[PDB]
Amino acid sequence: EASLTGAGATFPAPVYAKWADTYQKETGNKVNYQGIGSSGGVKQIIANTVDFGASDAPLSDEKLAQEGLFQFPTVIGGVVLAVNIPGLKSGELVLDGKTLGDIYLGKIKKWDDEAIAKLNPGLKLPSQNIAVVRRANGSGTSFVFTSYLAKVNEEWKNNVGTGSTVKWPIGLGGKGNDGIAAFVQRLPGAIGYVEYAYAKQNNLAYTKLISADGKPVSPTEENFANAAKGADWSKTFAQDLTNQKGEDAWPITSTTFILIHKDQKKPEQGTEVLKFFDWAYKTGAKQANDLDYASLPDSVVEQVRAAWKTNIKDSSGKPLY
């Protein structure tokens, strides 16, 4: 039995924790996962204070080569806009990218703004002020969200840009996906971006969004999977899944990555990390779907296995898989 420690992204934390509990029950192996944000996960793996790091923002091939790291995707999730609007039920408000950007730029300040009313003809919107909530920590969810806004709102792209940390025009700061969930819950009129599981688990209302093709879509595991149907995984695991074309393609979708060292100084730990992720691919799909995360296609998991064999070795050059 081994004790493993991982750290990083809160985006997939609900599923990593579920897998860890089940894995211990079946095998006795212990996996301790710390949700400290993707930036923190990257610093930790490079500092070698953990067996594996986790980040929703992929590292470039050069940065991976420079640090002697290897990265692989685990699941596909989606970012949603959790809202606290009195009188509105979940899934009934619809927003488009342009308007969402104008809300985050501070251009739109009330829930009954003309720009929002026009997108929601049947709705009777309140003249409630909007309280914007964003991440206070270095975040892979912020990276995905800002990558999306830069595509749909030019003023956002030119003035604030994309990043795991940016100079937010307005808004209160919440720590982790759980921190944003807690804020929305306690602030009438609030809007905040979180990975879907956090909204669902906390019974938070969320909005629909207009797809890249121009149709309103609901956030569901299937619709996150739809956003990834045209990604060519054979070329690279670092796929951008925001604003993708296609029927029922959730616009703010993303996969997430695990980072491990190519030259394993503690081979026994390295071997056990791969066994845990292999077990998750083989048996953990049901748990991932229970939490509304879509699974990676079998072809992709096969590419990852082929890559483990070629890349992960001990100091004597022997493969650990």
UniProtKB/Swiss-Prot annotation:
Induction: By phosphate deprivation. Positively regulated by PhoB and negatively regulated by PhoR. GO terms for cellular component: ATP-binding cassette (ABC) transporter complex, substrate-binding subunit-containing; membrane; outer membrane-bounded periplasmic space. It comes from the Bacteria. CDD domains: PBP2_phosphate_binding. GO terms for biological process: DNA damage response; phosphate ion transmembrane transport; phosphate ion transport; response to radiation. The keyword Signal applies. One of its GO terms (molecular function) is phosphate ion binding. SUPFAM superfamilies: Periplasmic binding protein-like II. Keywords: Periplasm, Phosphate transport, Signal, Stress response, Transport. Phosphate binds at residues 9-11, 38, 56, 139-141. It is found in: Periplasm. InterPro entries: ABC_phos-bd_PstS, PBP_domain, Phosphate-bind_PstS. The complex is composed of two ATP-binding proteins (PstB), two transmembrane proteins (PstC and PstA) and a solute-binding protein (PstS). NCBIfam families: 3a0107s03 (TIGR00975), PRK10918.1 (NF008171). Belongs to the PstS family. Part of the ABC transporter complex PstSACB involved in phosphate import. This is Phosphate-binding protein PstS. It comes from Escherichia coli (strain K12). The lineage of its organism: Bacteria, Pseudomonadati, Pseudomonadota, Gammaproteobacteria, Enterobacterales.
